[PDB]
Amino acid sequence: ADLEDNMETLNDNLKVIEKADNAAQVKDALTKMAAAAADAWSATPPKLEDKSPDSPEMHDFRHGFWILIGQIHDALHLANEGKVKEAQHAAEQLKTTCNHCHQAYR
Amino acid sequence: ADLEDNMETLNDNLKVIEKADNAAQVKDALTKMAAAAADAWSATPPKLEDKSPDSPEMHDFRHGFWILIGQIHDALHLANEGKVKEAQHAAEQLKTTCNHCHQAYR
Amino acid sequence: ADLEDNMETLNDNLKVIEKADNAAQVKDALTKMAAAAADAWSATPPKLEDKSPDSPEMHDFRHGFWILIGQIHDALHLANEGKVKEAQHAAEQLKTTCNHCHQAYR
Amino acid sequence: ADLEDNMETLNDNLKVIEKADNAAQVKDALTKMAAAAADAWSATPPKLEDKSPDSPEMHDFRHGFWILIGQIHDALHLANEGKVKEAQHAAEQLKTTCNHCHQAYR
Ligand code: HEM
Ligand code: HEM
Ligand code: HEM
Ligand code: HEM
Ligand SMILES: [Cl-]
Ligand SMILES: [Cl-]
Ligand SMILES: [Cl-]
Numbered sequence: 001a002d003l004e005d006n007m008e009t010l011n012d013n014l015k016v017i018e019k020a021d022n023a024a025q026v027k028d029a030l031t032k033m034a035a036a037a038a039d040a041w042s043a044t045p046p047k048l049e050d051k052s053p054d055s056p057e058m059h060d061f062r063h064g065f066w067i068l069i070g071q072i073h074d075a076l077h078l079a080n081e082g083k084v085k086e087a088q089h090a091a092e093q094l095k096t097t098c099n100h101c102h103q104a105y106r
Numbered sequence: 107a108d109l110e111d112n113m114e115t116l117n118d119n120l121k122v123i124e125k126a127d128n129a130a131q132v133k134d135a136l137t138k139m140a141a142a143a144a145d146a147w148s149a150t151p152p153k154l155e156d157k158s159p160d161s162p163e164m165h166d167f168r169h170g171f172w173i174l175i176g177q178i179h180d181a182l183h184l185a186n187e188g189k190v191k192e193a194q195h196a197a198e199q200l201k202t203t204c205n206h207c208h209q210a211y212r
Numbered sequence: 213a214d215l216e217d218n219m220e221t222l223n224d225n226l227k228v229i230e231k232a233d234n235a236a237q238v239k240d241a242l243t244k245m246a247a248a249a250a251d252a253w254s255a256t257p258p259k260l261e262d263k264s265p266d267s268p269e270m271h272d273f274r275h276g277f278w279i280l281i282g283q284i285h286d287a288l289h290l291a292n293e294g295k296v297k298e299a300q301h302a303a304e305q306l307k308t309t310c311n312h313c314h315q316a317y318r
Numbered sequence: 319a320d321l322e323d324n325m326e327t328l329n330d331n332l333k334v335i336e337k338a339d340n341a342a343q344v345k346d347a348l349t350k351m352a353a354a355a356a357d358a359w360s361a362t363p364p365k366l367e368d369k370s371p372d373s374p375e376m377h378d379f380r381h382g383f384w385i386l387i388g389q390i391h392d393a394l395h396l397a398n399e400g401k402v403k404e405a406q407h408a409a410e411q412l413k414t415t416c417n418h419c420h421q422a423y424r
């Protein structure tokens with residue numbers, strides 16, 4: 001999928017997680033976020049289109065996806081263990097990763 | 107790219123890293139491995155073609171990619187710091203991740 | 213050292229990182245935080261003194277140190293790469309981990 | 319505890335995990351390994367006794383503990399999810415980390 005659609009998937013599933021009542025809902029949403037974050041790896045955003053594909057700037061951009069991907073990984077373990085509230089808290093906390101990349105690269 | 111092509115990219119760049127004698131070669135190779143691992147996320151392996159796309163078995167398959175992605179992340183930091191030998195050691199260590207997924211799913 | 217001494221080390225060095233001008237200052241501070249976080253692992257916090265040493269509650273308490281330790285690890289790589297502002301951002305993101313444990317267990 | 323006691327704890331519990339029949343046995347063993355790895359952070363290994371406690375060499379030594387600690391974290395999630403075999407495999411994958419540090423520093 002394109003970067004924009006992967007970002008919409010992240011947005012939409014964050015809201016699903018916030019409103020969720022049970023593990024299954026949170027797991028399903030985190031599963032979708034994991035796939036969107038991994039698929040976003042290949043994208044070059046408009047504001048870096050004039051940089052070389054493996055420039056320093058592109059390395060720093062992609063670092064944020066490593067952080068996000070790691071955070072989703074941990075949140076899904078918590079949800080898998082039935083720690084629904086803790087998985088929800090983890091999802092709220094990773095908004096900072098979203099925000100940090102947007103501040104620099106959106 | 108398809109799973110087989112991403113796997114060839116991973117395999118080829120691991121060999122580049124082994125033979126490398128400067129940071130740039132190792133960084134470039136790890137960069138390519140990071141992209142191939144992320145792109146592999148969406149693939150259904152032949153052995154699980156008869157399972158639902160977000161079955162338990164497919165969750166367990168994809169878990170190995172989180173591990174691999176994390177290991178590539180750390181190796182690139184070591185290479186970025188000019189610790190070329192230590193980045194090469196990290197690359198050797200992450201073969202265990204490759205091997206473990208292959209044993210269960212190849 | 214006891215938990216309170218390790219907490220003072222964490223608190224003091226977070227402030228050092230905020231006010232730092234160069235990578236060496238940030239690296240030194242993160243180094244100290246890494247040691248304090250690892251040493252804090254063995255502590256029983258006052259509010260869980262009435263629980264068994266390896267109770268579920270104590271497992272959930274120690275999970276926060278895994279998160280903190282991992283965040284310090286990554287921040288030090290950023291500082292080692294000379295990315296002072298990015299290491300400072302990572303340090304600010306650490307506070308969420310600090311705050312979350314305090315809310316639940318202090 | 320001293321480094322040798324922490325190393326014996328790691329070694330003993332790896333063998334417990336290998337022979338284990340159920341999740342509880344594996345979780346208990348991984349719990350003990352987590353504590354030993356964190357406690358090992360403060361130790362100076364004999365072969366670096368002539369280096370300053372926060373020398374470059376000591377930084378490189380301690381990096382291996384970040385790796386080990388992270389791996390134990392993940393293994394315990396797998397055990398917590400009831401994935402006994404997969405937690406056992408993760409414990410076996412740990413040995414690469416053990417071996418790497420031993421080769422350079424033991
Ligand atoms: C959970 C975390 C995140 C959420 C919820 C999120 C959400 C969004 C949304 C809703 C958009 C607008 C999408 C559209 O065009 O319709 C967007 C755009 C963008 N995001 Fe994210 N994002 C996240 C994480 C990240 C991270 C980690 C990075 C960089 C490493 C990033 C980089 C971007 C960029 C470059 C755009 C602009 C291109 C675009 O419009 O798609 N995002 N994000
Ligand atoms: C650096 C790590 C890895 C390396 C070097 C590696 C290398 C390879 C190679 C050479 C192949 C042969 C087929 C081809 O060229 O496409 C292959 C196939 C495969 N690998 Fe990997 N791999 C790695 C990691 C992983 C991981 C972590 C997983 C699963 C989580 C995985 C799953 C598979 C599967 C399912 C196949 C069979 C593909 C098919 O039959 O179409 N690999 N890998
Ligand atoms: C950078 C992160 C953190 C900072 C800056 C920080 C700072 C502090 C400070 C200033 C105190 C005051 C108590 C004292 O030192 O006498 C404290 C107490 C405490 N912190 Fe943290 N902390 C951090 C992370 C954590 C984490 C991750 C946990 C749990 C996983 C935690 C658990 C506690 C507990 C239980 C106390 C109460 C100790 C007592 O009452 O004796 N802290 N922390
Ligand atoms: C699961 C992983 C590991 C296992 C099973 C393990 C096991 C052992 C054992 C059985 C010893 C002999 C201890 C003695 O009685 O004196 C030892 C020594 C040692 N290990 Fe490890 N180890 C592991 C990981 C590590 C790591 C990651 C490092 C370094 C980062 C490390 C550094 C050392 C050093 C320096 C010694 C020699 C000092 C001593 O004798 O205690 N080990 N290890
Ligand atoms: Cl929570
Ligand atoms: Cl404890
Ligand atoms: Cl970086």
Ligand SMILES: [Cl-]
Nearest residue numbers: 342343345346
């Ligand atoms: Cl147990």
Ligand SMILES: [Cl-]
Nearest residue numbers: 195418421422
């Ligand atoms: Cl080495």
Ligand SMILES: [Mg+2]
Nearest residue numbers: 009012013032
């Ligand atoms: Mg969706």
Ligand SMILES: [Mg+2]
Nearest residue numbers: 114115117118
């Ligand atoms: Mg080839």
Ligand SMILES: [Mg+2]
Nearest residue numbers: 214215216217
């Ligand atoms: Mg005291």
Ligand SMILES: [Mg+2]
Nearest residue numbers: 080169396399
């Ligand atoms: Mg799992």
Ligand SMILES: [Zn+2]
Nearest residue numbers: 074077275391
């Ligand atoms: Zn975790």
Ligand SMILES: [Zn+2]
Nearest residue numbers: 180183285289
């Ligand atoms: Zn590292």
Ligand SMILES: [Zn+2]
Nearest residue numbers: 191192195422
């Ligand atoms: Zn090495």
Ligand SMILES: [Zn+2]
Nearest residue numbers: 179183286289
């Ligand atoms: Zn990093």
Ligand SMILES: [Zn+2]
Nearest residue numbers: 100297298301
């Ligand atoms: Zn930043």
Ligand SMILES: [Zn+2]
Nearest residue numbers: 089311312315
């Ligand atoms: Zn909280």
Ligand SMILES: [Zn+2]
Nearest residue numbers: 073169392395
């Ligand atoms: Zn995991």
Ligand SMILES: [Zn+2]
Nearest residue numbers: 210403404407
């Ligand atoms: Zn296995």
